[PDB]
Design a protein around this ligand. Structure first.
Ligand SMILES: [Mg+2]
Lengths: 456, 463, 59, 52
DNA sequence: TAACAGCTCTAACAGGAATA
RNA sequence: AUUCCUGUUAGAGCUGUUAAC
């Protein structure tokens, strides 16, 4: 009776780099082969501008200057590879901004820092960057710096400063990579340098890496939600995301609101069929008009009876819909025996019951570690001693745990904002959550869909 | 016998010539008839929907079965035909067809002597059912004995008849059609295998670097308990506060259900409100605790009470989750020595209850959160090691310490901790262990639960 | 899904490697996959090998 | 979008390869919004004739 | 609609850095 | 907010079972 269904260990997915040289470890592949878009030369040179109070301007220069110099990791050295600088690693020059592009935060912002008005501070920062509206062609990425003195308005009830700033700047179509004191503080320089370098390259327009041998005929939808604490009740903001791969070589990643008022996070028939029809049109626009032969949907909560029918009624017969619910909090947890010195292998999925499986998104990975070669690496050994297996509840897929499990495992590796090996959730879920926060903060975004490079 | 998957493989390898002896299933059978596969289909019931589905698929009528019309159609090779047995004019047709190609029979349990002798007479010839005879039933054990007798008789005769267990006939045909190749667009548009609302994908075989989970199986399929009848309606909150103010030696819930001693019930409830006391037999424990959350809480609390009844370990509660916390007074027992080894750093003795290094009065101890998990139709006891803090509301003040102690409780250390805690909680190692616990053994309404001692585990399938 | 697609080939090979099967184009693989699919049924194995190499696709 | 002014310098230098590379690299602003549009109308001024 | 049980998730803080 | 998600403190939404209105 103590016997369970045979677990199957999904192999670590590969990532595509320059000249289609595959590698599981992203940063090492970036060092050896370079960014995926290097062959296309899509970003070309990267030109970036600043927007910060003058009293901290030099700091930005320093970090940007130190982006152009090699760095050797001291923390998490078991995983991180030696940094070689933007010019060498990304095969792309990093452009020193000129004085015309460089901007200064307008003085009244400092004053409103005393007032504790987040909306006023965000609007004042937008007006400070307004000097860069006309010169959009000159620079590619803006580097807004928020000093620690503004921490009073960084986070407070009902307001998120970075969220508000990005929600205001996204309709203007200019990426920002907000930099706070944290990036400067942080001991291990190579960690932050990998993070900022990858973030800037991807925000310019390049693709640091892509899922190797990814199917272009499958679209992986992901729906998430966020809480707005209304005075009378609650507000649930639900937004969707897509990570499909177009007929070209690059791949797309776009999120959008699901919309007038919702008190529960469960989309009705009308709303769910509307968001799925919008997703279908989005996928059609990229692939000349071809149907998606298989659709994955990752929801944080269970699908309702009406919601499943809404998902079905939006597509034709040829499309295969595998509705999946992802559960992060479970009583189960696994121990690896041969007692293995390292935790259970990442990707080991255990079919518990019909339409219920345990996926170990978190776990040891073989051949990724740099120091002590040939040994497993546990990314989250700092936080947790053992990995926490997530649980998939299937609602619609006709059959096969392998499809959903491998798809999710590969999806947890293409978060460019993340500078570590993987995540806990597929990028669809995390980006839907991020855009849910963005929409919840700013209601006037619901009309338009946005790319991942803006909010990442 | 053979697994349904190998039957599917054999059918798909040679489906151009295989019979069918007898909605989504009927429609896809008509589609297969149109695709010229499985030319000849036999049936017993009226079931005029096969020809209607075929007409919808193709747009032309279906030959439905004269003196020897079936013989004339089969001999002239003018497939496809749909002949109904209606149970000698089919006897010769069935004999010739059995000579030609093999048969798969679904939706039939036998029980009819006419078709039984029909098939038995079809078997005898030199080359009868060359590809094989496949009697498919939703469940092998539920089939009538005559079917198994005929299968054994055919196997003895040298034929390759098999009895495979699959799902419902329509589900079987859907699974078959999802792997048939080179089908025209119109047919796939017509059928599309409808839609699968109640997803149910088979669990693979046990197989043989295994992983050891924390789940302990519960094989107690049913338990006996008591019911009290009230002359007035009650709310669950009133019962809960009555237990809190009285604290009897029994476990109570509303669904009013109880488990313990009758005098405790007479203490909690006066004679006037009590009508009578009877018994309840929850036949399916898993289904009951899945359907009703009150039963879930009641059963988990019953197992908890039975688990620490005779053991020195203390039982606490935190956000409605029960914990087996080690008392300071009994922390020096020899049974904890194994745990002393597991917590120990670099092969030494390890403290399991003490004072946090940087707080005035908080005292820490090792503990395990014990939960009930209803997965599928199985009950699992869920053990999670944890560090408990004596003040319930001051726990966060030891947060750093909690991070400090568990920082290096890696796979080997956590394995040792879990094994030691299982040994402490049950007294035996996970080898051949089905120990029994009982809550309130000296009461009329007691509960005995037999919990598998070995934690749930599975080995990766390999060659 | 076809078989000569690169994505489907990679997905199927990853699935095969998930169950501990041989990795890539290595010895004792062709016979291994034959004996796995056909579970020691030489008649069915022969019929499949006949169908794959039949005298209708040959030019 | 707006082409880089470096395209004019490359065209004056008479380098077709670098001019094509610069025209393609000018497309990143639209590539951040590749879903937005269907067809891109690339215009070339007569001053680039030397590299046509 | 008002309690009760469980499952599950997000909201706000705080917080250290990958076998020691 | 380069990042990761481990904890803590709470609340909500889903289901249920009762009491009704
Ligand atoms: Mg970022």
């Amino acid at each position: 009776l103590s016997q369970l269904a045979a677990h199957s260990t999904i192999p670590e997915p590969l990532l595509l780099f320059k000249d289609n040289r595959t590698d599981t470890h992203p940063l090492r592949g970036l060092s050896q082969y370079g960014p995926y878009s290097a062959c296309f030369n899509l970003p070309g040179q990267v030109r970036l501008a600043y927007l910060a109070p003058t009293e901290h301007m030099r700091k930005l220069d320093a970090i940007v200057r130190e982006l152009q110099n090699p760095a050797t990791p001291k923390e998490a050295t078991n995983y991180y590879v030696e940094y070689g600088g933007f010019e060498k690693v990304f095969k792309v020059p990093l452009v020193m901004p000129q004085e015309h592009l460089r901007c200064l935060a307008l003085d009244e912002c400092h004053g409103v820092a005393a007032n504790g008005n987040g909306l006023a501070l965000a609007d004042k920062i937008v007006q400070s960057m307004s000097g860069l509206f006309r010169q959009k062609h000159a620079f590619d990425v803006l580097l807004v710096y928020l000093p620690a003195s503004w921490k009073k308005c960084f986070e407070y009830d009902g307001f998120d400063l970075h969220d508000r700033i990005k929600a205001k700047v996204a309709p203007l179509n200019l990426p920002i990579q907000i930099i706070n004191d944290t990036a400067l503080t942080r001991q291990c320089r190579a960690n932050v340098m990998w993070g900022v370098s990858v973030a800037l390259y991807a925000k310019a327009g390049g693709i640091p890496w892509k899922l190797a041998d990814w199917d272009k005929d499958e679209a992986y939808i992901g729906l998430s939600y966020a809480i707005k604490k209304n005075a009378e009740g609650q507000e649930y903001t639900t937004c969707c995301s897509q990570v499909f791969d177009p007929d070209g070589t690059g791949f797309e990643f776009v999120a959008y609101d699901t919309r007038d008022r919702k008190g529960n996070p469960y989309l009705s028939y009308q709303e769910m069929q509307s968001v799925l029809s919008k997703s279908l049109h989005l996928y059609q626009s990229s692939h000349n008009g071809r149907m998606p032969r298989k659709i994955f949907i990752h929801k944080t909560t269970h699908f309702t009876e009406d919601e499943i029918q809404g998902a079905f009624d939006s597509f034709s017969s040829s499309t295969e819909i595998e509705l999946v619910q992802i559960i992060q909090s479970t009583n189960w947890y696994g121990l690896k025996v041969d007692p293995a010195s390292y935790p259970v292998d990442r990707g080991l999925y255990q079919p518990l019951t019909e339409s219920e499986c345990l996926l170990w998104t978190q776990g040891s990975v073989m051949g990724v570690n740099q120091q002590n070669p040939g040994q497993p690496v546990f990314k989250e050994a700092a936080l947790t001693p053992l990995p926490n297996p997530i649980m998939l509840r299937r609602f619609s897929g006709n059959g096969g745990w392998h499809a959903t499990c491998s798809s999710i495992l590969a999806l947890t590796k293409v978060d460019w904002n993340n500078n570590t090996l993987y995540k806990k959730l597929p990028v669809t879920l995390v980006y839907s959550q991020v855009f849910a926060d963005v929409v919840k903060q700013t209601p006037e975004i619901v009309n338009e869909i946005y790319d991942y490079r803006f909010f990442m | 016998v053979l697994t349904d998957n190998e039957f599917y493989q054999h059918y798909l390898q040679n489906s151009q010539h295989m019979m069918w002896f007898l909605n989504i299933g009927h429609r896809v059978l008509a589609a297969l008839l149109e695709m010229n596969q499985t030319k000849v289909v036999f049936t017993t019931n009226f079931d005029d929907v096969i020809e209607t589905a075929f007409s919808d698929i193709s747009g032309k009528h279906l030959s439905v079965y004269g003196s020897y019309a079936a013989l004339s159609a089969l001999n002239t090779e003018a497939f496809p035909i749909y002949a109904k047995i209606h149970g000698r004019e089919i006897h010769k047709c069935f004999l010739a067809a059995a000579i030609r190609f093999g048969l798969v029979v679904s939706g039939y349990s036998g029980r009819d002597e006419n078709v039984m002798t029909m098939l038995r007479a079809a078997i005898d010839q030199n080359n009868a059912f060359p590809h094989g005879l496949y009697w498919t039933v939703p469940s092998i054990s539920k089939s009538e004995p005559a079917v198994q007798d005929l299968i054994t008789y055919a196997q003895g005769k040298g034929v390759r008849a098999y009895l495979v267990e699959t799902g419902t006939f329509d589900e079987m045909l859907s699974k078959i059609w999802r792997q048939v190749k080179d089908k025209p667009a119109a047919i796939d548009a017509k059928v599309r295998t409808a839609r699968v609302c109640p997803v149910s994908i088979p669990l693979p075989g046990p197989g043989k670097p295994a992983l050891r989970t924390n789940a302990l199986p519960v094989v107690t399929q049913s338990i006996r308990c008591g019911v009290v009848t009230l002359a007035s309606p009650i709310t669950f909150s009133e019962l809960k506060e009555r237990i809190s103010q009285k604290s009897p030696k029994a476990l109570l819930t509303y669904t009013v259900l109880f488990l313990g001693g009758e005098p405790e019930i007479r203490k909690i409830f006066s004679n006037d409100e009590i009508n009578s006391i009877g018994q309840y037999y929850i036949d399916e424990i898993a289904q009951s605790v899945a359907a009703s959350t009150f039963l879930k809480s009641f059963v988990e609390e019953a197992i908890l009470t039975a688990l620490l009844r005779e053991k020195p370990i203390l039982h606490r509660v935190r956000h409605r989750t029960h914990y087996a916390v080690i008392p300071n007074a009994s922390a020096k027992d020899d049974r904890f020595l194994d745990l002393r080894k597991a917590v120990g750093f670099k092969g030494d003795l390890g403290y399991i209850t003490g004072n946090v290094t940087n707080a005035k009065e908080l005292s820490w101890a090792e503990a395990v959160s014990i939960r009930l998990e209803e997965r599928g139709g199985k009950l699992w006891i869920m053990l999670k090691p944890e560090i408990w803090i004596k003040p319930l509301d001051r726990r966060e003040e030891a947060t750093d310490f909690i991070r400090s102690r568990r920082r290096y409780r890696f796979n080997q250390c956590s394995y040792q901790i879990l094994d030691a805690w299982i040994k402490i909680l049950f007294g035996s190692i996970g080898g051949g262990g089905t120990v029994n616990i009982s809550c309130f053994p000296d009461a009329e309404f007691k509960a005995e639960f037999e919990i598998g001692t070995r934690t749930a585990f599975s080995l990766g399938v390999g060659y | 899904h076809d078989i000569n697609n690169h994505a489907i080939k990679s997905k199927i090979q990853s699935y095969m490697d998930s169950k501990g099967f041989p990795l890539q184009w290595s010895p004792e693989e062709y016979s291994f996959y034959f004996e796995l699919v056909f579970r020691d049924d030489y008649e069915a194995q022969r019929k499949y090998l006949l169908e794959a190499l039949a005298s209708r696709k040959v030019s």
